[PDB]
Design a protein around this nucleic acid. Structure first.
Lengths: 65, 430, 32
RNA sequence: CGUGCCAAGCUGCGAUAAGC
RNA sequence: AGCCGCACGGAGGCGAA
RNA sequence: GGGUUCCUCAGCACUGCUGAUCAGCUGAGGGU
């Protein structure tokens, strides 16, 4: 029984989410671009350093293993 | 009364009320970043140069690296935080932080546990057969180093947290993923090459470039999602205008939250295998390294290289499973830690000056009403995204990429709020 | 704030870390 | 009496409103 | 080759169409 | 007849036969 209730309710709340939604802002080539640009940038920035450290430090572990 | 004695014994970091220049917060952060790589690279002192593959599931979230001085990484700290949110979350240990007591209680306490979980994980790791040779003597030695390295991070986090920019954890994670990418794709045994070479060799291997694509796609997707937002707040309109909204929950709301959901699963695949080759199959039958049956199995993220269709049901469960945990964490974080009332209102209204009126009652109500979308959704969604981000699968981690990208942007913001606060020595709250 | 009866200046943790590195960095590698 | 993103006075203008 | 009256703000906009 | 003096919020340089955290006062919104 209760199960039916809750099921009836979620359907309601979820519908309450409606009147709330219908808003989201799709990104514009301009904004989207600029952003995704900084993201990848920082990503590679955090990646490189790990490389500079890793790669070689393994050339060692490896040539002395 | 509380565990205040040993709690007062646990060192902390000296926070200077002096002038900490942007240039210094920056330079500081950087020093932490590097010491991170050093450890993440250095291997743990252990004669058994032979280690049983790796746990392609814990690293990412735990942004660490098995076999190195940081083989446990942020893992403990996260675990710890997970429990707290669990207790102080399901009311089990109801606490109204408000007072600097509960606040500093919840904290100090968790910190300790972090050191507890620091060793536990260590032992659990070796006990899960993360290295192969259980020489009671050698085993002991290892555990030492292991958990002690993670300790350094706990304190390096503290440093960044009070001497630089952004956050240790946040950083650290982004630190790892970024590297995992730049190296995996371009490093020594780099993929871009393995692919490029495969082209030259004359046998174009779509499996060498694949994972690299996986990452672009994710990044692109994850970013879009990280964009979603509301809008003023005044009109401008476009324009402006004066006053001053006005936000609109989004993705970074359920950040720390999802970090905990994924981390929960992290401690299950670890805790199951651990309590597998060291007892009874409570959680699942691993074999082959990871798990091939049990709670463990149904709760193991599918990513790595390519998406696995050959197990629909497996997908479904995971997804739904991840969603539940996500929502749970999100709630235990708002009970909690989500846009409060005091501070909110207290500050709010401002833009004192013709442009022309202001605000007042009713506004708060409306906001709260049209604000119950985040928390639940924010996470429910994210968690979904994160998960699906894994089916697709990508370098560094389908779910990890989501955090990184976010952490990196919240880290850009940090760099700006700073570039400015470095001018008007006062508005350190607007 | 913190109930940590003890105060530790970052310069230390950093140097203490440079410690872990040197120790194991040589404790392991540079065999013999 | 209106008209400006915010516009009280002055000036301009007139629902095409400091303009077409 | 600037401009958005007196009117030097904030935001935003117009101008080699 | 007055004309916003009404209600709310924020205020105290002005007005209030003293003072004021109050107000028919000052500012912004709202209200028929």
């Amino acid at each position: 029984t209760d199960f039916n209730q809750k099921i009836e309710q979620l359907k309601e709340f979820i519908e309450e989410c409606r009147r709330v939604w219908l808003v989201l802002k799709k990104p514009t080539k301009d904004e989207y671009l600029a952003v995704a640009k900084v993201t990848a940038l920082g990503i590679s920035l955090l990646g490189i350093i790990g490389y500079i450290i890793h790669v070689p430090a393994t050339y060692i572990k490896g040539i002395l293993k | 009364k509380k565990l205040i004695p040993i709690l007062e014994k646990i060192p902390e970091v000296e926070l200077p009320v002096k002038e900490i220049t942007f240039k210094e917060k920056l330079k500081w952060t950087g020093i932490v970043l590097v010491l991170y790589f050093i450890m993440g690279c250095i291997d743990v002192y252990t004669a058994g140069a032979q280690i049983p593959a790796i746990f392609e599931f814990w690293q990412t979230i735990t942004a660490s690296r098995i076999g190195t001085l940081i083989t446990l990484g942020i893992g403990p700290i996260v675990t710890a935080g997970i429990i707290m949110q669990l207790l102080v979350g399901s009311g089990i240990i109801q606490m109204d932080l408000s007072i600097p007591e509960n606040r500093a209680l919840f904290q100090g306490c968790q910190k300790l546990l972090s050191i507890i979980m620091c060793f536990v994980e260590a032992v659990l790791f070796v006990g899960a057969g993360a290295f192969g040779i259980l020489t009671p003597l050698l085993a002991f030695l290892v555990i030492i180093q292991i958990a002690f390295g993670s300790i350094i991070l706990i304190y390096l986090d503290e440093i960044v947290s009070k001497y630089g920019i952004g956050s240790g954890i946040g950083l650290f994670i982004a630190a790892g993923v970024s590297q995992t990418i730049f190296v995996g794709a371009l490093g020594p045994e780099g993929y871009l090459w393995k692919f490029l070479n495969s082209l030259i060799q004359g046998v174009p291997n779509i499996e060498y470039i694949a994972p690299i694509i996986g990452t672009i796609i994710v990044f692109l997707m994850v970013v879009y999602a990280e964009c979603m937002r509301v809008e003023i707040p005044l009109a401008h309109g476009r324009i402006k205008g004066a006053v001053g909204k006005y936000p609109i929950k989004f993705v970074y709301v359920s950040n720390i939250p999802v970090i905990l959901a994924a981390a929960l699963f992290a401690n299950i695949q670890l805790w199951g295998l651990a309590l597998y080759r060291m007892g009874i199959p409570i959680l699942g039958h691993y074999e082959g390294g990871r798990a091939v049956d049990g709670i463990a199995y149904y709760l193991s993220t599918p990513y790595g290289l390519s998406s696995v269709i050959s197990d629909p049901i497996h997908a479904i469960v995971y997804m739904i499973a991840m969603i539940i945990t996500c929502v749970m964490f999100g709630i235990f974080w708002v009970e909690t830690t989500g846009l409060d009332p005091k501070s909110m209102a207290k500050r709010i209204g401002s833009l004192g000056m013709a442009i022309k009126g202001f605000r007042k009652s009713a506004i708060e109500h409306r906001l709260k009403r049209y604000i119950p979308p985040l928390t639940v959704m924010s996470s429910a969604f994210v968690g979904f995204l994160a998960t699906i981000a894994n089916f697709i699968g990508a370098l560094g981690g389908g779910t990890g990429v989501l955090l990184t990208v976010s952490i990196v942007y919240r880290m850009y913001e940090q760099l700006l709020r700073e570039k400015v606060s470095e001018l008007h020595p006062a508005i350190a709250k607007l | 704030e913190t109930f940590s009866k003890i105060r530790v200046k970052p310069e230390h943790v950093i140097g203490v870390t440079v410690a872990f590195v040197i120790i194991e960095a040589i404790l392991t590698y540079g065999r013999f």
